[PDB]
Design a protein around this ligand. Structure first.
Ligand SMILES: [Cl-]
Lengths: 24, 24
């Protein structure tokens, strides 16, 4: 099975990049 | 830098695991 990742951004005041990965 | 990751779960049954990584 394959891993998928994507960048998600959060406002904290900079904007923080976060990597979100799941197994599709 | 160093990546800090953690498991997050959405109990929706069927539980959806995801991994979230930010960089320090
Ligand atoms: Cl974190």
């Amino acid at each position: 099975a394959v891993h998928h990742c994507k960048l998600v951004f959060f406002a904290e005041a900079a904007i923080i990049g976060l990597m979100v990965c799941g197994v599709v």
